[PDB]
């Protein structure tokens, strides 16, 4: 009937820890690319795209991946560098994927 707006998702954040070794954290995409949905939508935006890390991609999918499988917790398979964090980390500008688009 009419287009109506979204909210803000709160709660959990599932992804990599900024500042593990770039190796380790490198490991997802490379896993988690062998999925389906990770390989291709890892594609940048330029909101924070720059700078860009490694493991960057994996976090962009790990927004729908995380609700490909149901939304919940477990849907972390990346690696024990991507996984839920502690409440909101977006400091500002830069917002931290929590799932919904």
């Known amino acids: 009937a009419t287009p109506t707006p979204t909210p803000k998702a709160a709660g ?18 490379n896993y988690a690319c062998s999925q389906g949905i990770d390989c291709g939508p890892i594609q940048p935006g330029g909101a924070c795209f720059e700078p860009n890390t490694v493991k960057a991609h994996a976090a962009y999918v790990m927004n729908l991946y995380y609700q490909h499988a149901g939304r919940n917790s477990w849907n972390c398979d990346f690696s024990q560098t991507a996984t839920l964090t502690n409440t909101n980390p977006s400091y500002g500008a830069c917002n931290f994927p929590s799932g919904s688009n």
């Open 12 to 29: 959990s954040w599932c992804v990599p820890k900024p500042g593990v070794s770039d190796d380790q954290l490198t490991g997802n995409i």
